[PDB]
Coordinates of C-alpha atoms in Angstrom, one line a residue:
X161 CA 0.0 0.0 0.0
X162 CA 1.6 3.5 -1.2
X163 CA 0.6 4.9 2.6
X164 CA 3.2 2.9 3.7
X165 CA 5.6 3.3 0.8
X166 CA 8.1 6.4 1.3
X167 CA 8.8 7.8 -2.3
X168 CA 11.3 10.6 -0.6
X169 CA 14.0 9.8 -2.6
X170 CA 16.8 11.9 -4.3
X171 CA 14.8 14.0 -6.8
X172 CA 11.5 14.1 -4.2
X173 CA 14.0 15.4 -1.3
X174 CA 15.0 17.5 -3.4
X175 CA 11.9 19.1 -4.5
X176 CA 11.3 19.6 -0.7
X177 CA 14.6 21.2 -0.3
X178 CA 13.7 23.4 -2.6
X179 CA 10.6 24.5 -0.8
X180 CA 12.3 24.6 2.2
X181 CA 14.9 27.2 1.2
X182 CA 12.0 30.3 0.4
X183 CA 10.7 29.9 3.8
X184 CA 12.0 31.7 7.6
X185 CA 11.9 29.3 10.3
X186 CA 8.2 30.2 12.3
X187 CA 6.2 31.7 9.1
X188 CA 3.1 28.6 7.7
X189 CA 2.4 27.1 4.8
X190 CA -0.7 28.4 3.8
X191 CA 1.4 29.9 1.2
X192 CA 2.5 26.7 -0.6
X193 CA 1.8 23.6 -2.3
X194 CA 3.0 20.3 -0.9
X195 CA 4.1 17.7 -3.4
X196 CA 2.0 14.4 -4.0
X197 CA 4.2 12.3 -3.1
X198 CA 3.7 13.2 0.3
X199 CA 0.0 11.9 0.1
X200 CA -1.8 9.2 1.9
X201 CA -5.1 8.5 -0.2
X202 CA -7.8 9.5 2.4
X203 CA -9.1 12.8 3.0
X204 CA -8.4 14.3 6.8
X205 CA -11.9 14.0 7.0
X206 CA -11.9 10.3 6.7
X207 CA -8.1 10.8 8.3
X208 CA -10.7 11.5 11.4
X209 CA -12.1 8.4 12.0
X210 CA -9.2 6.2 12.1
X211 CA -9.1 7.7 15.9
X212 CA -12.9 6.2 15.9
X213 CA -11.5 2.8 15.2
X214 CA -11.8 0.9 18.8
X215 CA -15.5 1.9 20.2
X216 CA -15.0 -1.1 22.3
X217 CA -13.3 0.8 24.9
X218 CA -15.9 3.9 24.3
X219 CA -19.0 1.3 25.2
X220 CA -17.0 -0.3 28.0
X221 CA -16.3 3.0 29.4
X222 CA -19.8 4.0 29.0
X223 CA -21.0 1.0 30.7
X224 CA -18.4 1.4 33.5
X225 CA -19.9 2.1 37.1
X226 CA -17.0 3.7 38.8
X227 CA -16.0 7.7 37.6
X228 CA -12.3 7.3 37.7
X229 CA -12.4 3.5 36.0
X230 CA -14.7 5.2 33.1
X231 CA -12.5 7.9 32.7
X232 CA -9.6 5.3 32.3
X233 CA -11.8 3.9 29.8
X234 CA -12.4 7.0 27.9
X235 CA -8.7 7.3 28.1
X236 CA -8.1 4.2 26.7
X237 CA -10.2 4.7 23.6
X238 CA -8.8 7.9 23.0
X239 CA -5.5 7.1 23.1
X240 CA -6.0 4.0 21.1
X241 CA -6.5 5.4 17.3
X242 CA -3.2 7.3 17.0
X243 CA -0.8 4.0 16.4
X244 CA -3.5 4.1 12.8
X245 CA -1.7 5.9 10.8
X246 CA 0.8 5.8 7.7
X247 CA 3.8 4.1 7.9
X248 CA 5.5 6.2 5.6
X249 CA 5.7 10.0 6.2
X250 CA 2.4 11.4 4.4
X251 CA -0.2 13.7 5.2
X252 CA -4.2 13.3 4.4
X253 CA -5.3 15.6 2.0
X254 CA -6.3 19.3 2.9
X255 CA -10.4 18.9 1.9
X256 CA -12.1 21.6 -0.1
X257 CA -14.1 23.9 1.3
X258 CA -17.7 22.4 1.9
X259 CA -16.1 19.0 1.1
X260 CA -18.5 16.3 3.6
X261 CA -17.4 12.7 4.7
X262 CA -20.0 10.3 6.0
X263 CA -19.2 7.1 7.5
X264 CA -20.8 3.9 9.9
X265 CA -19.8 1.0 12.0
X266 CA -21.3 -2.3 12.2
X267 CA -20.6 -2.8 16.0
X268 CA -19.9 -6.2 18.0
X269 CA -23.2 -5.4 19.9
X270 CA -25.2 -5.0 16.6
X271 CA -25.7 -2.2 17.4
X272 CA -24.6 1.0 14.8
X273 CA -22.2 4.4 15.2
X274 CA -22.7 6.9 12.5
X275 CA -20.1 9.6 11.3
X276 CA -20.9 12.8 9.5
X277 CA -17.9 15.7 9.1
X278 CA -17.7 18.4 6.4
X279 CA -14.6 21.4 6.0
X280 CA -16.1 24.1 7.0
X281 CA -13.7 26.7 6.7
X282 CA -10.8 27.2 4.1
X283 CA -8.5 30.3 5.5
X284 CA -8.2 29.1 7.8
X285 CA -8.2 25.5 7.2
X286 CA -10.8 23.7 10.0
X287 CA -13.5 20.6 9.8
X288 CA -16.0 19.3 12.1
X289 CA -17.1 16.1 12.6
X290 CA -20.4 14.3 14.9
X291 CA -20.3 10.6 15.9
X292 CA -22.9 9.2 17.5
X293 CA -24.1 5.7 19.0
X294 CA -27.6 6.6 20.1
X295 CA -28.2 2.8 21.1
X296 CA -25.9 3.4 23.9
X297 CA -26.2 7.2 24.5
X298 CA -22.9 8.0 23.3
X299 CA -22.5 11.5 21.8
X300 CA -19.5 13.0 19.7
X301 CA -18.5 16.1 18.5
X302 CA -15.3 17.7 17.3
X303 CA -12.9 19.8 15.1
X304 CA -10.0 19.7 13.5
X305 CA -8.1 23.2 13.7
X306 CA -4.5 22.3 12.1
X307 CA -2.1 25.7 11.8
X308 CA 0.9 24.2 9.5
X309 CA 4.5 25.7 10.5
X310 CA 8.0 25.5 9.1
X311 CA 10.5 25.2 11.7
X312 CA 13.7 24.8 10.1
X313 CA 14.6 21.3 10.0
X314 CA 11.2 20.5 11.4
X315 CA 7.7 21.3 10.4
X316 CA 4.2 20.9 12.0
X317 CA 0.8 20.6 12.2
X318 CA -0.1 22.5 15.0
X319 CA -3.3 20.6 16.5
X320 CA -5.8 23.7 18.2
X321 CA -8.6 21.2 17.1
X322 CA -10.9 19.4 20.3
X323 CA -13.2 16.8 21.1
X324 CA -16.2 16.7 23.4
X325 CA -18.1 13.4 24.3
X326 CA -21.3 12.9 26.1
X327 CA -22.7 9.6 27.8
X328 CA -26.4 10.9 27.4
X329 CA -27.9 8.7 30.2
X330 CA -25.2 9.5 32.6
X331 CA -26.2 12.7 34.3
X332 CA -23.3 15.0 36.4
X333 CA -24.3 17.3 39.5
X334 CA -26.2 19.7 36.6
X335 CA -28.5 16.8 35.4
X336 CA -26.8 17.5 32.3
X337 CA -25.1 14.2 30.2
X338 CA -21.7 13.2 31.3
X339 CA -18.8 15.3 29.4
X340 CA -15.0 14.8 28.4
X341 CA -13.3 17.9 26.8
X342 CA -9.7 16.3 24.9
X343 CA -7.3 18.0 22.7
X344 CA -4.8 16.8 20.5
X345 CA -1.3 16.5 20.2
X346 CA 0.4 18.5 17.7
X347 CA 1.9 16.4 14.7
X348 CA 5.6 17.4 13.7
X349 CA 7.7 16.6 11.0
X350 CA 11.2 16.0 11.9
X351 CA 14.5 15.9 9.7
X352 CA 13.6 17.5 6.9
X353 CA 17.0 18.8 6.3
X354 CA 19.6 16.2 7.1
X355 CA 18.7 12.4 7.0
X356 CA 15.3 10.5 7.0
X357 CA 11.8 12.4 7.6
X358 CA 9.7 10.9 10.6
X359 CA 6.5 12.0 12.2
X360 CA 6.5 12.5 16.3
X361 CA 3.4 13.5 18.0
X362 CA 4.8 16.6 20.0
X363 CA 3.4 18.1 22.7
X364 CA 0.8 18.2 25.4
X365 CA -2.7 16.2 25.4
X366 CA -5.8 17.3 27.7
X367 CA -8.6 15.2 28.5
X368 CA -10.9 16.5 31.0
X369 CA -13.9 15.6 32.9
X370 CA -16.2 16.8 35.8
X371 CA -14.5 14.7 38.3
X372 CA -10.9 13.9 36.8
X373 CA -8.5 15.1 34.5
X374 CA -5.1 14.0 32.5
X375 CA -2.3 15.8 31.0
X376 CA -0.5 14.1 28.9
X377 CA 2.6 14.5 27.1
X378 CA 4.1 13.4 24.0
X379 CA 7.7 13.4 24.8
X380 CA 10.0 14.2 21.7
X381 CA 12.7 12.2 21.0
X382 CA 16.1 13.8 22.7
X383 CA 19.2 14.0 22.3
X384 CA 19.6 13.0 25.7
X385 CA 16.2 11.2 26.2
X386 CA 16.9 9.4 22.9
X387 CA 13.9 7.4 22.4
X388 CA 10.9 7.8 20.1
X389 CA 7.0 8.0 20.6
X390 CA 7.1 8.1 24.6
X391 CA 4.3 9.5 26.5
X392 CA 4.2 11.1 29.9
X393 CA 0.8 11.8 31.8
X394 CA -1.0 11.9 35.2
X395 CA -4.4 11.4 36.3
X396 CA -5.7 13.7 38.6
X397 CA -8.4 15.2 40.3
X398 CA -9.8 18.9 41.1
X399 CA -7.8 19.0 44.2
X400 CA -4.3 18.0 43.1
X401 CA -4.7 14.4 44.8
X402 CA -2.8 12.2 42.0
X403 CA -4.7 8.7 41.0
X404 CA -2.6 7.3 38.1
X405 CA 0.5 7.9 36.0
X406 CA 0.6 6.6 32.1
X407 CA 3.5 5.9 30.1
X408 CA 4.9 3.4 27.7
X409 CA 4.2 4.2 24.1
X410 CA 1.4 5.7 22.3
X411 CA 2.3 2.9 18.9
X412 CA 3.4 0.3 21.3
X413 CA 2.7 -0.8 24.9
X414 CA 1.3 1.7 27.4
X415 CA 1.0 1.5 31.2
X416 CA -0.7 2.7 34.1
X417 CA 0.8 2.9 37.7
X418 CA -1.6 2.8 40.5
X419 CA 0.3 6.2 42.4
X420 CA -1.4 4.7 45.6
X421 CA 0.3 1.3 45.7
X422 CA 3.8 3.1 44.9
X423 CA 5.5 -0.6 45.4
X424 CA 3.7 -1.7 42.2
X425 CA 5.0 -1.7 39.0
X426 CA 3.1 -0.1 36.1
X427 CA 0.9 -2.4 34.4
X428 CA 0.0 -2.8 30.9
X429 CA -2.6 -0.2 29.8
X430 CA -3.4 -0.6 25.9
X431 CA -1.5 -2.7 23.8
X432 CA -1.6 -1.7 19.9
X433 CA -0.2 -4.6 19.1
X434 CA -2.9 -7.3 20.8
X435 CA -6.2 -4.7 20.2
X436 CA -7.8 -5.1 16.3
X437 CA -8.9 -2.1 14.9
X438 CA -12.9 -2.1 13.6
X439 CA -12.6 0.3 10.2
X440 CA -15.7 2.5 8.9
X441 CA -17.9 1.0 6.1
X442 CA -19.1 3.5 3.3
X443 CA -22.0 3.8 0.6
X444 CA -20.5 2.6 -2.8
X445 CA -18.6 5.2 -4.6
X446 CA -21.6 5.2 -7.6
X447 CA -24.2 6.5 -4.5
X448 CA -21.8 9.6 -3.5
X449 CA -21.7 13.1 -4.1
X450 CA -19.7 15.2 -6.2
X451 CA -18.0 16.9 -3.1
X452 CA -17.8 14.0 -1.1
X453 CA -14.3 13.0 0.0
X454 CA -13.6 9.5 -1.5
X455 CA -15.3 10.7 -5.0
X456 CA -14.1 13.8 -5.1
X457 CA -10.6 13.0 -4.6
X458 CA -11.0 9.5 -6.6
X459 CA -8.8 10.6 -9.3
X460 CA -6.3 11.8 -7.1
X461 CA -6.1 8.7 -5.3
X462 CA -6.3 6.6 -8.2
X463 CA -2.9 7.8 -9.6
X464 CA -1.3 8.1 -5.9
X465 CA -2.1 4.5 -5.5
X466 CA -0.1 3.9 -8.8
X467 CA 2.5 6.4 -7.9
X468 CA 1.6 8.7 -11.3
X469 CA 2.3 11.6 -9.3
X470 CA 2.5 14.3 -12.9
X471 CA -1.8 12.8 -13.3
X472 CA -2.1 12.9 -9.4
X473 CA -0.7 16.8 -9.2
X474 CA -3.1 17.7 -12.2
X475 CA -6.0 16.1 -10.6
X476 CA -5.0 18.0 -7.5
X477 CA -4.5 21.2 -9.5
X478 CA -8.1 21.3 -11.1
X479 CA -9.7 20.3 -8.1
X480 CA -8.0 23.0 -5.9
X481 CA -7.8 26.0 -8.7
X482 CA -12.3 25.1 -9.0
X483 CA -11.9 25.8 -5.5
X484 CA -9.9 29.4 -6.0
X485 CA -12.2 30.5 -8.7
X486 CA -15.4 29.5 -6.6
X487 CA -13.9 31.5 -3.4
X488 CA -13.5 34.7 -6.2
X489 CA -17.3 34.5 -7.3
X490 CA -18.3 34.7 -3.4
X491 CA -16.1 37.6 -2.7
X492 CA -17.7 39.2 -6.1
X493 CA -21.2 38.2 -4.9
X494 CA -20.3 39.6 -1.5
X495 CA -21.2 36.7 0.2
X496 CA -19.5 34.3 2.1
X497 CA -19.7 30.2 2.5
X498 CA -21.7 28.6 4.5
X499 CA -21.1 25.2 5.7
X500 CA -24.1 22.5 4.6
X501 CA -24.4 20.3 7.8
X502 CA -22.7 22.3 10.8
X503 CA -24.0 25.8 13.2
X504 CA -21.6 27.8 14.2
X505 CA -21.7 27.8 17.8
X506 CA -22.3 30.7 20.0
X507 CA -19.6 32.2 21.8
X508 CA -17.8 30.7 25.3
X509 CA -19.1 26.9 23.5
X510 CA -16.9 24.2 23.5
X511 CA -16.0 23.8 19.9
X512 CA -16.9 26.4 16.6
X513 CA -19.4 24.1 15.1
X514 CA -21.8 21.4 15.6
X515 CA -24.0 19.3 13.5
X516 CA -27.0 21.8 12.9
X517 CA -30.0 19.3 13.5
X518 CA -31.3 19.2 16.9
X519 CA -31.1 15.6 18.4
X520 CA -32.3 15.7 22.5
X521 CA -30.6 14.3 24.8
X522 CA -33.7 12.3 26.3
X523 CA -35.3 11.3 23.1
X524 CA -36.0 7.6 22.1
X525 CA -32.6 6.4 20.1
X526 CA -34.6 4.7 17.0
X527 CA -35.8 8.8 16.7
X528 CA -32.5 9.5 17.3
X529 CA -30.9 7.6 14.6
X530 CA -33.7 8.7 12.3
X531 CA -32.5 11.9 12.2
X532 CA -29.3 11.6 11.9
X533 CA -29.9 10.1 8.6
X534 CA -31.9 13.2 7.4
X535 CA -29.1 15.1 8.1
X536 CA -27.1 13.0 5.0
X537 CA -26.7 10.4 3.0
X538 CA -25.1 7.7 5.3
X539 CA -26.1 4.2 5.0
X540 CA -26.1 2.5 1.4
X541 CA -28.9 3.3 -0.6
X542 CA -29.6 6.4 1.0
X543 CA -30.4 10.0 -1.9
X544 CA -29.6 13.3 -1.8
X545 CA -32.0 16.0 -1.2
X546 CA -31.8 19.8 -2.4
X547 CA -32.1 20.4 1.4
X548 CA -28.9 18.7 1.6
X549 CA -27.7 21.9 -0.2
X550 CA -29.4 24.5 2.0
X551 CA -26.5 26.1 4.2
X552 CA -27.1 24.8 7.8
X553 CA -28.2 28.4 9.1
X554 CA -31.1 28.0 6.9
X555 CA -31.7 24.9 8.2
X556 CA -32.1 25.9 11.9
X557 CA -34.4 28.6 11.4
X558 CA -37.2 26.3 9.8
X559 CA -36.1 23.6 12.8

């Protein structure tokens, strides 16, 4: 599989050289265009759900009685999707503005989680996504805010992006639904001058909840603390008092020492090696929309699969420059985009947008899941509407 494959030899390292030689160590790259070859053939809106790939530990942790045990949980899960990933260094591709993703899972418990995202803003880049398994009142909803940097010999994604979950059934002290804030680690490119490109996860991770919270971080690979892919984290409560540390290895083994029993030795946490990833299904290509990531890019993919990178950077090209000329006619028209399937929150919320359609907290799940497949087509055999079309804002004032 090309994901896997690094095609940074001479005349590609070059090319990136190149690049690297017009830009002053802190400025982004908003400015210019990556080369193919430094693809993986998914979308970051699909990129997305490869962190969605072990709900086991999501419905365990909603089922789990004890607060700091489901927190461990919740911790568990999150942590678990990172290790799903490339092996070679590549990057999903930025989507287009208004681009939409929609995916499902055929759980172990027969039951179903559903998967909606769409890019809802271009400069700057940023996507939401909503996950939801209503048959076990677990709510998700998140966005991706990546700000790209040059470093020098390094670059980045830096990750301003978050997450909140809801177990809907489990009420805190506000009779509100149970609710985890997380962040992400920022994603850095290292040796891009001298030697071998690799990817290390960077800095510090937040997961919080109304009764714990973690800080964990990525540890970058020294000099002196030479060793790759390490995390360091603590579980704590409100009051300082210290339950847990975690380390080990967010692609290999990590542990968790009971700080209470301070003779024990850390214990293993999450193997990535023993755990089996469930993947998302999708609606055949032939059902999908124009703007919808797998078809949209299928092209592009097509020829990065066969490493045709001159039909791959055309493909790119047209897409992208539709994209430019579209933006022009708005700015023309004096109007701006407005994203299909996400509000934009109010301010002092947790994250800039959410799925627009109103789904309570207490209503029956088969209602639930109903409407969540109004919002979109998401299960095979589903059609378009023109309301489909109709910017969310439109949306909620009918609603």
């Amino acid at each position: 599989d090309t994901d896997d494959i690094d095609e940074d030899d001479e005349s590609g390292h070059n090319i990136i050289l190149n690049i690297i030689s017009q830009l002053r160590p802190g400025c982004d790259l908003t400015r210019i265009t990556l080369p193919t070859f430094i693809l993986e053939k998914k979308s970051m809106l699909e990129r997305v759900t490869n962190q969605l790939q072990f709900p086991e530990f999501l419905l365990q942790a909603h089922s789990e009685k004890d607060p700091l045990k489901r927190f461990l949980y919740v911790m568990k899960w999150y942590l678990a999707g990172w290790h799903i990933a490339p092996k070679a260094v590549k990057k999903p591709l930025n989507p287009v503005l208004g681009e939409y993703f929609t995916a499902y899972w055929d759980l172990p418990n027969k039951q179903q989680a559903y998967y909606i995202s769409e890019q809802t803003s271009h400069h700057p880049p940023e996507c939401a996504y909503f996950y939801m398994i209503p048959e076990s009142s677990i709510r998700v909803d998140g966005v991706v805010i990546p700000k790209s940097r040059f470093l020098g010999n390094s670059s980045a994604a830096m990750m301003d992006g978050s997450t909140v979950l809801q177990f809907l059934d489990i009420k805190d002290g506000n009779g509100k639904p149970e609710k985890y804030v997380l962040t992400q680690p920022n994603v850095y490119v290292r040796g891009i001058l001298f030697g071998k490109m690799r990817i290390e996860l960077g800095d510090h991770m937040i997961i919080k909840s109304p009764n714990f919270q973690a800080d964990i971080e990525f540890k970058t690979k020294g000099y002196v603390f030479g060793t790759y892919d390490a995390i360091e984290g603590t579980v704590k409560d409100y009051d300082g008092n210290a339950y847990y540390e975690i380390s080990g290895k967010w692609n290999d083994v990590m542990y968790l020492k009971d700080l209470k029993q301070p003779r024990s030795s850390p214990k293993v946490f999450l193997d990535t090696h023993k755990e089996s990833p469930l993947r998302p299904k999708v609606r055949p290509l032939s059902e999908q929309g124009e703007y919808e990531s797998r078809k949209l890019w299928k092209k592009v993919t097509d020829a990065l699969a066969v490493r045709n990178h001159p039909v791959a950077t055309e493909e790119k090209f047209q897409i992208e420059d539709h994209q430019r000329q579209l933006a022009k006619k708005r700015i023309e028209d004096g109007v701006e985009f407005h994203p299909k399937l996400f509000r934009r929150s109010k301010p002092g919320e947790d994250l800039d947008y959410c799925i627009y359609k109103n789904i309570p907290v207490d209503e029956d799940p088969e209602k639930q899941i109903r409407s969540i497949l109004q919002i979109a087509p998401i299960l095979p055999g589903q059609q378009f509407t023109d309301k489909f079309f109709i910017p969310a804002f439109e949306k909620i004032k009918s609603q």
